[PDB]
Amino acid sequence: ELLCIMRLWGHPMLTASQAAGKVRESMCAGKVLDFPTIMKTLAFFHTILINGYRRKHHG
């Protein structure tokens, strides 16, 4: 309860600079591509999709 009322002080006044700069900082941070993990994850995604399509059907 104390939390849910700790939010009672209104929002700050906005300006393009800060938020635009943060979502800009979402720019290049290192083209760190990891083929092993993405491949393992695509494999498990295929597997989950396959087992789900099997279950939600006679199959």
Binding site: V32, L33, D34, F35, P36
Partner: peptide, 26 residues
């Protein structure tokens, strides 16, 4: 020449192992 054939086998297995360890990580 059947020994040349086993060396062919060694060639293939070494190739697979090396290229695997190669393409494994970025």
């Amino acid at each position: 020449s059947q020994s040349l054939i086993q060396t062919i086998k060694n060639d293939i297995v070494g190739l697979k192992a090396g290229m695997a360890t190669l393409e494994g990580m970025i």
